Amino acid sequence: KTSFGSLKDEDRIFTNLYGRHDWRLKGALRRGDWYKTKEILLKGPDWILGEMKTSGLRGRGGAGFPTGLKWSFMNKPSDGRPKYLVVNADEGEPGTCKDREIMRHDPHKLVEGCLVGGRAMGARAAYIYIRGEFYNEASNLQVAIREAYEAGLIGKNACGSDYDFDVFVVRGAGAYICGEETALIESIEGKQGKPRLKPPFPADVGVFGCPTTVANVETVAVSPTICRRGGTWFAGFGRERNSGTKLFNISGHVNHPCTVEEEMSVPLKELIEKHAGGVTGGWDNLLAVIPGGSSTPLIPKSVCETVLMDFDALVQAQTGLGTAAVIVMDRSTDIVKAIARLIEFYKHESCGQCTPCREGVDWMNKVMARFVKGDARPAEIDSLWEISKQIEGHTICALGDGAAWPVQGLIRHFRPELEDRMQRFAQQ
Amino acid sequence: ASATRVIQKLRNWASGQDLQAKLQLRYQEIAKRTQPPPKLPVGPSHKLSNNYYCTR
Numbered sequence: 157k158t159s160f161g162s163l164k165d166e167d168r169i170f171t172n173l174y175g176r177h178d179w180r181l182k183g184a185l186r187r188g189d190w191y192k193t194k195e196i197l198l199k200g201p202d203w204i205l206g207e208m209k210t211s212g213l214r215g216r217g218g219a220g221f222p223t224g225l226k227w228s229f230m231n232k233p234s235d236g237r238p239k240y241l242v243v244n245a246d247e248g249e250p251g252t253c254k255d256r257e258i259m260r261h262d263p264h265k266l267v268e269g270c271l272v273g274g275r276a277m278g279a280r281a282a283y284i285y286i287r288g289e290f291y292n293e294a295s296n297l298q299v300a301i302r303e304a305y306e307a308g309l310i311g312k313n314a315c316g317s318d319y320d321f322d323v324f325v326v327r328g329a330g331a332y333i334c335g336e337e338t339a340l341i342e343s344i345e346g347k348q349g350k351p352r353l354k355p356p357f358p359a360d361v362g363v364f365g366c367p368t369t370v371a372n373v374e375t376v377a378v379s380p381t382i383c384r385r386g387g388t389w390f391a392g393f394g395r396e397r398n399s400g401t402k403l404f405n406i407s408g409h410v411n412h413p414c415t416v417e418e419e420m421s422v423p424l425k426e427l428i429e430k431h432a433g434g435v436t437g438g439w440d441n442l443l444a445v446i447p448g449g450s451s452t453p454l455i456p457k458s459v460c461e462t463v464l465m466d467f468d469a470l471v472q473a474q475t476g477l478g479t480a481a482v483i484v485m486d487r488s489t490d491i492v493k494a495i496a497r498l499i500e501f502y503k504h505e506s507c508g509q510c511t512p513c514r515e516g517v518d519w520m521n522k523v524m525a526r527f528v529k530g531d532a533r534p535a536e537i538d539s540l541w542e543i544s545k546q547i548e549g550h551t552i553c554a555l556g557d558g559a560a561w562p563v564q565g566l567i568r569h570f571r572p573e574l575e576d577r578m579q580r581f582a583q584q
Numbered sequence: 585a586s587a588t589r590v591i592q593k594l595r596n597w598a599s600g601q602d603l604q605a606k607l608q609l610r611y612q613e614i615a616k617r618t619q620p621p622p623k624l625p626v627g628p629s630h631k632l633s634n635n636y637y638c639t640r
C-alpha cells in the first residue's frame with residue numbers, strides 16, 4: 157500500500173490500444189468483450205451502480221467526479237419522457253490522444269460501455285458525439301455499431317435482455333468548447349456550441365429537454381469490465397480515494413512520446429523514466445511539466461520528483477489532474493511563449509456568451525504576448541493575477557478557469573523570468 | 585529703482601526705514617511669464633493592483 161505505480165498486462169483494460177491484434181468483432185470478441193453482458197443487464201441497474209460506487213471510479217474527463225453518485229442522479233423513474241446517454245469524444249484539449257486511440261483500435265469496449273451504462277441508468281439510446289477532425293475514427297466506430305447491430309447486441313433485443321437500445325453517432329464541426337457537458341448538448345440539438353448555466357442539471361432536463369448523463373469515452377469503456385470483474389478489483393489499483401487504471405498521454409520534449417495505460421497514483425518520474433524514456437537531456441534538462449492537458453498549471457521540477465499522479469496529490473500541489481496528458485519542457489523553451497500560445501488557443505476556442513472569458517481571455521492574450529516581447533512593467537503581473545481571479549468563478553463553464561489557471565501557475569513559479577525579460581526590454 | 589540716490593535718502597529718512605531694498609514695484613525679481621512644461625505626479629489609487637473601490 158505504498159509506492160505503487162506499475163502493473164502488468166493481466167490488468168490492462170485497453171489491451172488493444174496500439175492496433176496490434178484487431179479492432180472488429182472478430183478479434184475484440186477474443187479479448188473478452190460481450191461475454192456475459194446479457195447476465196449483467198438481467199442483473200439490474202442498482203447492481204451496476206453498486207459496482208461503480210465500490211470501484212471508486214472518478215470521472216476520467218477533466219473534472220474528476222465519482223461516478224455512481226453521478227449516474228444515480230437519473231436512476232429515478234420515467235416522467236413520461238425518454239432518457240439518453242451522451243458520450244463525450246470531442247477530444248479537443250491539448251495533449252489528449254486517449255479517446256482517439258480507443259475510438260480507433262477498440263470501439264466495441266465503448267459500445268458495451270454505452271449499453272451497460274444505459275441499463276445502469278435508463279436510456280432509449282445513446283448519442284456518441286465525436287470530433288469533426290476524427291472522421292476515420294468515427295467511421296471505424298460506425299462499422300463497429302454496424303457489426304454489433306448485425307450480430308444482435310444492440311436494437312430490439314440487446315443481448316437478449318428484453319431491453320431495447322440504440323447507439324447513434326453525432327459528429328462535431330471543430331470546436332473545443334463543445335466538450336462541455338451542456339455545450340455538447342446544444343450542438344447536438346443543432347444550435348451554437350454554447351454551454352448552459354447548471355442548474356438545471358442535465359440529469360433532469362438535458363438533450364432535447366430530456367435527462368442525460370454526459371460521460372467521457374474511457375469512463376464508459378471501463379464500466380462493463382468493471383461489472384464483469386468487480387469494483388474491488390478496480391479499487392485495488394490506486395489509493396482509497398483515487399482509484400483505477402488510467403490512460404496517460406506524454407507529449408513534448410522526451411525521447412519517446414506515447415500513450416500508455418498505467419496505475420493511478422504512479423509517480424510522474426517513474427511515468428517518464430519507465431515509459432517514454434527520459435526527457436531530452438535527461439533529468440538535468442527538465443524545466444517544467446503540465447500534467448493536465450492545458451487547463452492545469454505548471455510544476456517547477458521541485459515537486460515532480462516526489463509527487464504522485466492523482467487528483468488529491470496534484471490538488472495539494474496547487475495543480476490538478478485533467479485528461480492526464482503530460483506535457484514537458486526542457487530549458488530550451490520560452491515558457492511565456494508556451495503559455496501565451498495556450499491563451500491564444502483558449503481565445504480561439506472561447507464561445508463568447510459570458511463576458512469574463514469573452515474579454516479577459518483577450519486581455520491576457522495581449523498581456524502575455526507583450527510579456528513575450530517584454531513591453532510591460534513588473535507592476536502588471538499582479539494585475540494579470542487579478543484578471544485571472546476575476547475570470548475564475550464568475551463564468552458559466554470551466555473554460556475561464558482553464559485559461560486562468562496556467563497564468564497563475566506561471567506567475568507562481570516563473571515570475572523572475574518575466575522580471576528579467578521586462579528589465580531586458582527596458583534597458584534596450 | 586530710479587531715485588537718483590538723494591531723493592532715495594530723502595524718502596528713507598522721511599519714512600524712517602529703508603524701502604529701496606523692499607519696494608512696492610516689481611522689476612526683475614519675479615517669475616518670468618513663460619515657463620517650462622511641468623509633469624504633475626499621480627496620486628494613490630493608480631496602484632494597478634490591489635486597488636478595489638470597495639475597500640476605499
Ligand SMILES: Cc1cc2nc3c(=O)[nH]c(=O)nc-3n(C[C@H](O)[C@H](O)[C@H](O)COP(=O)(O)O)c2cc1C
Pocket residue numbers: 214215216217218219220221226244245246247248249332333334335336337370371372373375553554555
Ligand atoms: C472547455 C471544456 C472542454 C471539455 N472538453 C472535454 C473533452 O474534450 N472530453 C471530455 O471527456 N470532457 C471534457 N470536458 C469535461 C466534461 O464536462 C466531462 O468530460 C463530462 O462532464 C463527463 O464527466 P466525467 O469525467 O465525470 O465522466 C470539458 C470541459 C470544458 C469546460
Ligand code: SF4
Pocket residue numbers: 333351505506507508509510511512513514551552553554555556
Ligand atoms: S467561459 Fe468562455 S467558453 Fe465558457 S461559457 Fe463563458 S465565454 Fe463561453
